[PDB]
């Protein structure tokens, strides 16, 4: 349940560490973002030498949440941290590697690149 003003860890090579959620894309007045939802964010912390710097508005997709999320099978998934992946307009990562596990919801949202690059998909 990421929403306005939420802080997210970044799981990429882009060089950013933490981002702030500006808007949850996918409809007007939409409140929450779960795994597999695209948001707009701003970069708060970064590598000094990274391509992405502080203060630039970027587009990301949530890959991990602390709030439990139900699956159609009756099972539930949960993580210890809220994490996101920087993407470009064609739903492709800006980085080259992904850190940590991701939920399989990304598979049904057509984020094939993130799914392939993740070390583990759950």
């Amino acid at each position: 349940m990421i929403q306005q003003e939420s802080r997210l860890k970044v799981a990429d090579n882009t060089g950013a560490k933490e981002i702030l959620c500006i808007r949850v894309l996918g409809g007007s007045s939409r409140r929450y973002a779960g795994i597999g939802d695209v948001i707009v964010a701003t970069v708060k912390d970064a590598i000094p030498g990274g391509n992405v710097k502080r203060g630039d508005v970027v587009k990301a997709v949530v890959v991990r949440t602390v709030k439990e999320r139900r699956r159609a099978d009756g099972s539930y998934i949960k993580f210890d941290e809220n994490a996101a992946v920087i993407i470009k307009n064609d739903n492709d990562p800006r980085g080259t590697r992904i850190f940590g596990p991701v939920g399989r919801e990304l598979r049904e949202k057509k984020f094939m690149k993130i799914v392939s690059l993740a070390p583990e998909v759950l």
Binding site: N13, G15, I47, G50, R97
Partner: protein, 709 residues
């Protein structure tokens, strides 16, 4: 211009440039690269804008501390210049680069005489048959005497050293050099290289230099009639002579002298030509002897891209973004992405030799002393490292050094080969460190990850060894010297966040009895569980060192129960483990406990009770006589030059040391047999190297124990 990508190892050259600390190796590398056209202008070491001088430690120390690799293209031939550290503290990196290259370049200043570190580095290059070409740099210095450096190199590094190109200048900014074999003088005075016939002011000297170079080269050639032809008045052909010079230089026989003016760009183009033609080839160079994975040796493999897959890492580091920058040097076969290579850890058995005492085999790191492991890992992206930025490599043929990312278990020097045919090359002999240092964590959480941090650092730093002391309960890091110690501590506190503070290293120590005495132990403790009360009477006698712990029982009539004899015994063992000299009692050793008498109760006898009863009997016995402390004397094999044996005799005399002999190690150095207390050997390596100017090598090995003087 075009990215250097050669389709054959013969069109690839890799040179590990060597020299003193801040000798201009990087500067010459930048000048050459600009001559090749990779860099717009040659950067300055001090400015830190060069491709090689990018790391934090290299810029901070204002010199080369970790080696760097750059790729160059010249007339369709690839050149891989490899800057190497100029300080003996990082001579392990230089050794790896020499092992990583088929040619070495001595970057020295014309205003500096050849120092002993340079001589020892030349010896290290020499007894691996690694070819060398003498390079004279820093000719712009006001005191730059090219002729003095030339003569010193010829006199020191054998008669095989002889000038190849003769510089011409006004004494302040050399305006050109003269090509002896090409009889043509190249002039840079007007800002443009001009291969023109000499003006004739030094025609006789040039001709003499041509004759000397020819006769020196002929000596190492094949045609024995060439000497008769040249001495008979016949002029040998220029092309044939050149080919003969290439043979002499490649075969690790000749060491031509090259003047270089890096600042003005004078001589860089002709140096590139010499690298491209006269320098040895990775196929021609005597490749390290290959080994089967299971300990058997194997015939050396040809530097053929079509041959069996064969490679060896030369540097390892961790990058959060691109990944682990594993500098892998390819020797046989072609390396391609998506290929699973063998990651054998040197199969250290083949490198357990040499390495001085420490048996330096693979990545040192005594906690991981000798890797000797196997692994097959799928490589990721092949990249040609240009400083931080990596040049993509779609195909990497044999005879090249490349950086491979996303290698999970890769370490420095690990041999990379085919999964179907695992292979092991001969890794470099690494100068195991002999300066111990102790690191204490600020808390427990950092210490928990300290193990993996030091393991990763040792994988990155093959020359570094990390030692854990179980007796004194501390972790000890061994570094070659001071600057390398600073670099490794910075890397530990940065790449792994290890917050520690330097502390004194404590040597192992033991306690022994100086006399014989008897003890009385009375225990009374009536608690809420089982009432405890036991009395024991033992006897202890002094025993020679190395006797260990002993126990004799002579109780009469079964006064103390047999079941509680183990209780008393173990109580005495724990009490003597805790020591007898105050609250800081060192482990008492080589003592015999002799129990004779004791009293028993119907119910108050217990395991713990009798344990303390024996303990207190031990205290009472120790209270009656003296306790002698022993320190472990270690055999020290001191290797110093024969002229420096007098210095070692003089200083070891002030070190309470005894000399058991001075055996001549070789024509220059001398092995000195001596045993010294361990307290004197914490800083022996650093002072030895400082006094010997890098000529000091020594071994340590605990022998026995001696009392306090």
């Amino acid at each position: 211009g075009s990215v250097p990508t050669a389709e054959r190892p013969a069109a690839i050259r890799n040179v590990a440039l060597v020299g003193p600390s801040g000798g201009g190796k990087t500067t010459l590398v930048e000048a050459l690269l600009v001559a090749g056209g990779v860099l717009t202008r040659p950067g300055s070491v001090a400015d830190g804008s060069t491709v090689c001088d990018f790391d934090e430690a290299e810029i901070a120390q204002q010199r080369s501390v970790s080696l760097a690799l750059a790729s160059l293209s010249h007339n369709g031939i690839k050149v891989n210049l490899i800057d190497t550290p100029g300080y003996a503290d990082f001579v392990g990196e230089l050794r790896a680069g020499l092992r990583a290259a088929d040619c070495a370049l001595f970057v020295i200043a014309a205003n500096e005489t050849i120092d002993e570190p340079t001589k020892t580095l030349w010896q290290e290059c020499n007894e691996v048959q690694m070819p060398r070409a003498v390079v004279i740099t820093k000719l712009d210095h006001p005191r730059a005497n090219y002729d003095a450096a030339l003569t010193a190199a010829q006199e020191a590094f054998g008669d095989k050293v002889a000038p190849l190109y003769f510089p011409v200048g006004d004494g302040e900014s050399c305006k050109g050099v003269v090509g002896l074999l090409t009889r043509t003088y190249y002039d840079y005075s007007g800002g443009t290289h001009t291969a023109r016939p000499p003006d004739g002011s030094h025609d006789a000297a040039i001709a003499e230099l041509r004759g000397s170079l020819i006769e020196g080269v002929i000596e190492e050639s094949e045609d024995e009639t060439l000497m008769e032809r040249y001495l008979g008045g016949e002029e040998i052909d220029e092309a044939v002579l050149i080919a003969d010079l290439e043979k002499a230089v490649a075969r690790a026989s000749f060491f031509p002298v090259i003047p270089v003016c890096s600042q003005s760009g004078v001589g860089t183009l002709e140096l590139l030509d010499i690298i491209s033609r006269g320098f040895p080839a990775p196929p021609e160079h005597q490749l390290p002897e290959v080994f089967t994975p299971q300990g058997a040796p194997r015939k050396p493999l040809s530097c053929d891209p079509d041959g069996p897959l064969l490679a060896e890492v030369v540097k390892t580091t961790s990058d959060p973004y691109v990944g682990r920058v594993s500098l892998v040097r390819v020797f046989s076969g072609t390396i391609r992405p998506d290929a699973t290579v063998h990651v054998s850890g040197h199969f250290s058995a083949f490198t357990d030799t040499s390495g001085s005492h420490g048996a330096a085999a693979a990545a040192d790191g005594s906690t991981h002393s000798h890797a000797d492991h196997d692994e097959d890992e799928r490589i990721g992206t092949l990249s040609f490292p240009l400083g931080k930025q990596q040049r993509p490599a779609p195909t990497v043929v044999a005879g090249d050094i490349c950086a491979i990312g996303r290698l999970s278990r890769a370490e420095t020097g690990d041999t990379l080969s085919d999964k179907t045919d695992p292979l092991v090359l001969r890794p470099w002999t690494m100068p195991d460190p002999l300066l111990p240092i102790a690191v204490a964590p600020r808390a427990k959480t950092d210490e928990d990850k300290l193990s993996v941090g030091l393991q990763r650092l040792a994988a990155e730093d093959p020359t570094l060894r990390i030692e854990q002391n179980p007796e004194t309960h501390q972790i000890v890091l061994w570094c070659m010297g001071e600057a390398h110690a600073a670099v490794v501590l910075d890397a530990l506190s940065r790449r792994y966040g290890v917050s520690v503070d330097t502390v004194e290293l404590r040597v192992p120590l033991r306690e022994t009895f100086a006399g014989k005495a008897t003890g009385h132990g009375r225990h009374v403790k009536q608690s809420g569980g089982h009432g405890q009360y036991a009395v024991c009477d033992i006897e202890v006698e002094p025993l020679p060192e190395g006797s260990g712990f002993e126990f004799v029982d002579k109780v009469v009539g079964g006064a103390v129960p047999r079941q509680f004899i183990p209780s008393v015994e173990k109580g005495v063992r724990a009490q003597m483990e805790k020591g007898v000299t105050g609250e800081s009692g060192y482990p008492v050793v080589d003592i015999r406990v002799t129990l004779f008498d004791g009293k028993a109760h119907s119910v108050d006898s217990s395991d713990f009770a009798f344990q303390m009863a024996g303990a207190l009997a031990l205290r009472d016995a120790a209270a009656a006589t003296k306790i002698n402390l022993l320190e472990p004397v270690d055999d020290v094999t001191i290797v110093v030059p024969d002229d420096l044996v007098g210095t070692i005799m003089g200083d070891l005399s002030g070190r309470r040391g005894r000399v058991l002999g001075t055996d001549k190690h070789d024509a220059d150095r001398t092995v000195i047999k001596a045993e010294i207390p361990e307290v004197e050997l914490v800083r022996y390596a650093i002072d030895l190297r400082s006094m010997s100017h890098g000529a000091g090598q020594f071994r340590r090995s605990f022998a026995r124990y001696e009392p306090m003087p």
